[PDB]
Design a protein around this ligand. Structure first.
Ligand SMILES: Nc1nc2c(ncn2[C@@H]2O[C@H](COP(=O)(O)CP(=O)(O)OP(=O)(O)O)[C@@H](O)[C@H]2O)c(=O)[nH]1
Ligand SMILES: Nc1nc2c(ncn2[C@@H]2O[C@H](COP(=O)(O)CP(=O)(O)OP(=O)(O)O)[C@@H](O)[C@H]2O)c(=O)[nH]1
Ligand SMILES: Nc1nc2c(ncn2[C@@H]2O[C@H](COP(=O)(O)OP(=O)(O)OP(=O)(O)O)[C@@H](O)[C@H]2O)c(=O)[nH]1
Ligand SMILES: Nc1nc2c(ncn2[C@@H]2O[C@H](COP(=O)(O)OP(=O)(O)OP(=O)(O)O)[C@@H](O)[C@H]2O)c(=O)[nH]1
Ligand SMILES: [Mg+2]
Ligand SMILES: [Mg+2]
Ligand SMILES: [Mg+2]
Ligand SMILES: [Mg+2]
Lengths: 437, 429, 437, 429
């Protein structure tokens, strides 16, 4: 009862999944071999872990990659005994940062087996609540295979919600030449089939890690730990009791005002170093004030350019409803946060009793209070415009089109995807432009 | 899994392949006897990429050695790792083919190509999941250029979908050791442009210049040059063998680097490179590595990148580093050297990171560059070819073997078209 | 494997062959008895020697002379044990400096026996790849019989290449009256049949021995020793391992531009006495520069008056590619040494690790480096013009024609030979003209 | 191989042959008994050239002795090397023919020439590979002239393809001994020029002058003159008998010396010729020998070469001399004497070298000169012939024995033709 199925695709998705399942094992006290020696803990494991007669707890997770390297790393790693062997799926060769290769030619062999594994897990579940998908748009395997799997799962389980946590290409930083083609190709599929997708930018988390943790040169481990913290904060409402709980469906109903507009931005607070944590008291009001600043947003754009349409605050730790009511009143008073006129009440609050869990040897300081905000705004249209410019500038000369055409993709798909992204940007700018009574 | 079949043609290719297998055996911890005596499980985790396993733990290379003259085969068999190779994979003739492309391609090579393809087919059907081929050859010779082009064409017929990579030593106007090099190189380029996915041009002049100015070697010999080329060859294929934070398959590299299907002629490079005295005073970090690779004088071909523009760049880093440093440094390189990168690609740079550095070094990096400056080598080769062909200088030797002047004119026209396309995309805006 | 058959005709040919086989025996450590008490020696003898069951090593050679005295001197000399009895072929009467006598009347009896012995040797050979022929143009035997043998061998073994090392009449020094007639009659077959002819002059070697070695009166033994060193330098690439090996076909392909232009000059260095060897350095650049001096050309022609067309540098001993590349660059930037415009790269480099061997009781100093430089150039047209002038002066009066027509030829042969040499010198001066565009 | 048959005719020819065989027998280390007692194998290697091998090591000269009277042959039998000859080869008449050419040729000659040809044939079939013949005779006498000419004609009929060498003692106007010397020489010259391949003219005046001025002999007898001739006889045939660095047999010499077939009359010479007293005060070297041979006073034919020109020259050196010295001296001589040497032959000199010096002579050289100055002797003989033939009174002796005056006129015309040819080639330009 009250469980969700998690899917990890590509290298980014798999590594983030290792970070997330390490965090969940730490939160529920499950030692990595699966045993559980140790009253929310007596039921919270049922959300993410399934139990067997021997007392072992197995993740409800599936790991897929068309190349074997990362899956072999986790097979040899610390958590090798945690995951059931059938969950870990391997292809034979990566998509080579090619959407067509990931989707059409190579993904067809593995998609049937992946769907069979998901079907087995869903049959095991009763009272299933959702679908968490972790991938990256820039990759070939991530983009193509996630597009294929989301369309298949939308056909199979269309009456159930699906959540996405995707890594977005930065405006300047990049690690692949053909990122725009893969990203614009997969925006249509995620827009059509995803119920709520959360956007991530590596450069934003680099800046956040610099500013708030003093790390001069962080790595993917820290960013994946932060992603794990955000998703754990989202799922804590189901996993644990609270004074004001929010379910995934009611959360989506609050946050999503229109069908296509389902791309909120995520932020977390208080992110602080262990050196600076002692100095500041970290009250609810200052946590709420810090959570709204531009510099803490994890997609590199200023919300001051855009307009906020709906906000969802998820507090965990010692919190009282007065404090958050006063904090939201104070935030509504400030004019830098411009909410849309047509939405009178733009905030939904949830409170949870359990404090955030701190990983051993992590950079983030222990704190008795924490908040995670999911906010729908028009600022992401700027990042979409930047990516569209980066796409069309090279598409005008047909920069790398023959590689995609060789794998069965048609040239018209690029134009159709560009038209779809143009329509989405026009919708996003249209809804927030103005209103008259 | 994801195997590579290695092929060696001519004296230069055989020597470079010997140094390559020496380096790879040192990396994986394999004796000349072939027994494994490494120190980590990662070496055995993907030993199958380059080696096949025998009964008693002996690992045999998946190498094919070809040369029409058996002196090079005797030298390789008598070498330090000569015991490691399979005796059946030594295919050779009885006459060194002169320096005649016609003799290497048509008359002499026709007999040996059947046996070579038989051994290649045996090795390839022995593979669990073949990824591609590798071939070492010198374009100036007869045996190397001619029979390598013939073998490449026939392998492309047999295995059209697989990757085929070449590491080609181009003639140079200052280390010319043979009179008839322009004919052989011109005839080889027409086959190379069509029947290969990736080709890596190498210059003996650039290698000697690196050895003199950077390494300060007093009397460099071919061993050091082959060691540098083997370092590059080991560098490009790390992601298949060892884990890393970002993995670059050969197909991934090809997709990133090749915008248009005929622009696959790359310029390699390697860093760090230093003298023994300077190694002490040197600071060894990612900014130093990036600056060293993007320096022109570290490039492996006698060309200035400053003349042309970089269509694409790839950097395969090895060791443990924070890839934020890689990203910010490489963005800084792109910004501060914007005029040398084409406008019609926003980010010209691909990055990969592998955890294991090479042989005691704290870190290393292999640089690949697809640039418009590569046309200069073909320009000078075409000039020499035209100067010789105006008077029909040495054509009777080739027509005695069976060639025709129509093929010479076609090869010249094909090289002209290649440099025309490169100049077109240089001038594009 | 990779064998070569040596042929020695006439007094000059056999007397050079004595020194040549002495040098080969010393280099391979074979006693004149034939035993080898002494791993490059394990197969390097296979090029020139054939191993019997009892360990004796037999030369692959044929010695022919219509006059039996020199062959009897060989039979009585030190090397009587070395040579096979049948390979030492002998007639009964000398050719008497008469081309017609050597070619038509006396040669017909013994040419069949010579061809049978060569057939037997070729049958014993498994990878044979060339013929070595040593003779003098001035002698009746060395002209007529070698013309007959050259055309017969061209008929029999037309695929296989042929190399001649010929002694030419000097500009002024001459030991017979009918040398122009004999030489002019020889050149037609030399041009048509042989693949490469190496011209040598007695006067040039005398001047070389006077200047360099400081021997006041040189004798044939030193001339033969120098020619032996030349041929040993040519064959060392086949016989020994090296960084850059050049076989006979590779050599001919590099050095022969056109079919009728196959007459190189040959030089050796460091040709130096034992006294001067201690003072001089004799490094790579020094010997390379010494090779191009007009003094060391071995044929009395000025290289300045001609133009170089293709050069082959065969280094032996301790040499590195860097040094020879730098020396070649120096020689190319020098302007006294002028190359044709249509040959952008006129240098073919070969290196081997066997330093030169010094004969006992010799004159050449022991040196750890040596270079043999062969070069196709247009300077030999001057020597051909001198000989044609002598032939015209003698033939205008029909000086000695009665002896020649007595032995079965016509004046049409003389006229045709003169016309052929006229055409050859016309072609040689033709190729030296700069291109029109 | 390459054997020579030696024939002697007349008193002068018999004495010269006796000294010739004495010199050669001493050279090959053969006693008068014929037993070999040499010291080197080179003497015995080609002893077959002149000597036949009998049983028990006895060596018989291959010599024919002819004379129309027996006294000279009895003297030769009683000589120091008289026993060495074969008794069967002594063919004699009964009257010495006076000095009559007709008596020597026709009447007395016809009887004895058959037996002489019989013994010559007997030796000739015994020879394995016959090279040629040698003849010693005096043109001034009757017996020598008639028998030599008849025998030369018949041997040329028998063996047309074999070389014949004659060593003819020509008359001179100063040492004339008989009155009919012009008639005998005039009758002999026609057969000499027609039926001989080499003819070496000797003159008694020249040998007497050499003996007086050069050797300082107070009372030179015929033995010294014959020894001087025998020195050249041994010199010309040295290359056949002994090894050397440049071999020049009789056919090689003939091909080098005869441009046109009738110009085979040569001038011999020899060096070093010095007196026993002066020989201490002179260095024996190749320049000294080369100057001495070309000295006109060293010529053995009583001609002045400055009055004519050299067509060709031959030098047969003996000893261990080096040959660029020979070439330098020969080229220097040709440069200095370029007025004397004909312009239409570029190189007039034929060099030969042999390794074995003659008896007691560290070095030796034999000079052979074809020069236009030889016509002076024929001019003198023709002048005396015309002076005596203008009166028919003396011709009755020759008219007896069957001759006629048409023979005399024809012989005079032939000598005129010979000197005309020599003068024509002197005047050629
Ligand atoms: N970097 C290296 N270049 C080499 C080496 N050996 C030769 N070469 C160069 O290669 C070029 C000639 O190529 P090869 O000699 O291998 C000719 P190949 O054997 O392929 O054909 P044939 O001439 O028919 O034998 C020439 O520029 C040499 O300097 C080597 O070990 N390393
Ligand atoms: N150089 C020499 N000349 C000689 C010798 N004996 C004679 N002569 C000269 O040779 C010339 C010919 O004299 P011969 O008696 O030999 C004439 P031959 O016997 O051939 O004819 P007949 O007079 O009919 O007997 C004459 O001038 C002699 O003086 C000699 O021993 N040596
Ligand atoms: N935040 C984060 N991003 C990652 C991580 N690993 C890879 N990425 C991102 O993934 C992008 C490249 O696409 P990938 O997802 O690695 O490609 P893939 O899914 O393996 O598919 P292929 O291209 O076929 O190999 C890079 O631009 C990175 O930003 C990670 O561990 N953490
Ligand atoms: N360099 C050199 N030249 C020689 C030697 N022997 C002879 N000659 C030359 O050979 C030329 C004459 O040709 P030969 O070879 O002697 O004549 P042949 O081949 O024996 O034939 P014939 O003329 O019948 O004797 C002379 O001009 C010499 O210069 C020698 O040992 N060394
Ligand atoms: Mg991947
Ligand atoms: Mg080779
Ligand atoms: Mg000869
Ligand atoms: Mg008498």
């Amino acid at each position: 009862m009250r469980e969700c199925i998690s899917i990890h695709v590509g290298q980014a998705g798999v590594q983030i999944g290792n970070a997330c399942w390490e965090l969940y094992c730490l939160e529920h006290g499950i030692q990595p071999d699966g045993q559980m020696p140790s009253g929310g803990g007596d039921d919270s494991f049922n959300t993410f872990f399934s139990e067997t007669g021997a007392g072992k707890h197995v993740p409800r997770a599936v790991f897929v990659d068309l190349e074997p390297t990362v899956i072999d790393e986790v097979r040899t790693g610390t958590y090798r005994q945690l995951f059931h062997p059938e969950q870990l799926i391997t292809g034979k060769e990566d998509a080579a940062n090619n959407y067509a290769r990931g989707h059409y030619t190579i993904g067809k062999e593995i998609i049937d087996l992946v769907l069979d594994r998901i079907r087995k897990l869903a049959d095991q579940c009763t009272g299933l609540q959702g679908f968490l998908v972790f991938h990256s748009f820039g990759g070939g395997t991530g983009s193509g295979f996630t597009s294929l799997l989301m369309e298949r799962l939308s056909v199979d389980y269309g009456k159930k919600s699906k959540l996405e946590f995707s890594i977005y290409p930065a405006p300047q930083v990049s690690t692949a030449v053909v990122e725009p083609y893969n990203s614009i190709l997969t925006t249509h599929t995620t827009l059509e089939h995803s119920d709520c997708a959360f956007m991530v930018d590596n450069e934003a988390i680099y800046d956040i890690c610099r500013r708030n943790l003093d790390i001069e040169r962080p790595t993917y481990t820290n960013l994946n730990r932060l992603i794990s913290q955000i998703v754990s904060s989202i799922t804590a409402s189901l996993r644990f009791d609270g004074a004001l709980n929010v379910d995934l469906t009611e959360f989506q109903t609050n946050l999503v005002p229109y069908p296509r507009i389902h791309f909120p931005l995520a932020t977390y607070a208080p992110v602080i170093s262990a050196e600076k944590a002692y100095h500041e008291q970290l009250s609810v009001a200052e946590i709420t004030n810090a959570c709204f600043e531009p510099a803490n947003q994890m997609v590199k754009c200023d919300p001051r350019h855009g307009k906020y349409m709906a906000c969802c605050l998820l507090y965990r730790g010692d919190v009282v409803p007065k404090d958050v009511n006063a904090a939201i009143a104070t935030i509504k008073t400030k004019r830098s946060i411009q909410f849309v006129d047509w939405c009178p009440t733009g905030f939904k609050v949830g409170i949870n009793y359990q404090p955030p869990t701190v990983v051993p040897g992590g950079d983030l300081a222990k704190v008795q209070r924490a908040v995670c905000m999911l906010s729908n705004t028009t600022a992401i249209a700027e990042a979409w415009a930047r990516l569209d410019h980066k796409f069309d500038l090279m598409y005008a000369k047909r920069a790398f089109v023959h590689w995609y055409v060789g794998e069965g993709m048609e040239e018209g798909e690029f134009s159709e995807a560009r038209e779809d992204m143009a329509a989405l940007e026009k919708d996003y700018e249209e809804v927030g432009v103005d209103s008259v009574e | 899994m994801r195997e590579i079949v290695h092929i060696q043609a001519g004296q230069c290719g055989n020597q470079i392949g010997a140094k390559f297998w020496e380096v790879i055996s040192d990396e994986h911890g394999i004796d000349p006897t072939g027994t494994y005596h490494g120190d980590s499980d990662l070496q055995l985790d993907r030993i199958s990429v380059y080696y096949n396993e025998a009964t008693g733990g002996k690992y045999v290379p998946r190498a094919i050695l070809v040369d029409l003259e058996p002196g090079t085969m005797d030298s390789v068999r008598s070498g330090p790792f000569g015991q490691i190779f399979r005796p059946d994979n030594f295919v050779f003739g009885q006459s060194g083919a002169g320096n005649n492309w016609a003799k290497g391609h048509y008359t002499e090579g026709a007999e040996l190509v059947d046996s070579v393809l038989d051994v290649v087919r045996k090795e390839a059907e022995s593979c669990d999941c073949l990824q591609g081929f590798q071939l070492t050859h010198s374009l100036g010779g007869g045996t190397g250029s001619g029979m390598g082009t013939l073998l490449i064409s026939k392998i492309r017929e047999e295995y059209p979908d697989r990757i085929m990579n070449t590491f080609s030593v181009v003639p140079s106007p200052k280390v010319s050791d043979t009179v008839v090099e322009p004919y052989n190189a011109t005839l080889s380029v027409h086959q190379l442009v069509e029947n290969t996915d990736e080709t890596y041009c190498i210059d003996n002049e650039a290698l000697y210049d690196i050895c003199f100015r950077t390494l300060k070697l007093t009397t460099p010999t071919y061993g050091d040059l082959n060691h540098l080329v083997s370092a590059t060859m080991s560098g490009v294929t790390t992601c298949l063998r060892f884990p890393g934070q970002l993995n670059a398959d050969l197909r991934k590299l090809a997709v990133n680097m090749v915008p248009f299907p005929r622009l696959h002629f790359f310029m390699p490079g390697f860093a760090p490179l230093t003298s023994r005295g300077s190694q002490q005073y040197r600071a060894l970090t990612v900014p130093e590595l990036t600056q060293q690779v993007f320096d022109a004088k570290n490039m492996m071909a006698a060309c200035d990148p400053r003349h042309g523009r970089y269509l694409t760049v790839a950097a395969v880093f090895r060791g443990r580093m924070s890839m934020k440093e890689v990203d910010e440094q490489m963005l800084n390189v792109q910004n501060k050297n914007s005029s040398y990168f084409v406008e019609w690609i926003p980010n010209n740079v691909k990055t990969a990171v592998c955890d294991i550095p090479p042989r005691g070094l704290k870190m290393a990096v292999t640089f690949i560059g697809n640039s418009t400056a590569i046309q200069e080598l073909f320009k000078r080769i075409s000039e020499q070819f035209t100067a010789m062909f105006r008077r029909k200088a040495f054509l009777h030797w080739y027509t005695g073997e069976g060639m025709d002047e129509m093929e010479f004119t076609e090869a010249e026209s094909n090289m002209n078209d290649l440099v025309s396309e490169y100049q077109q995309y240089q001038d594009a805006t």
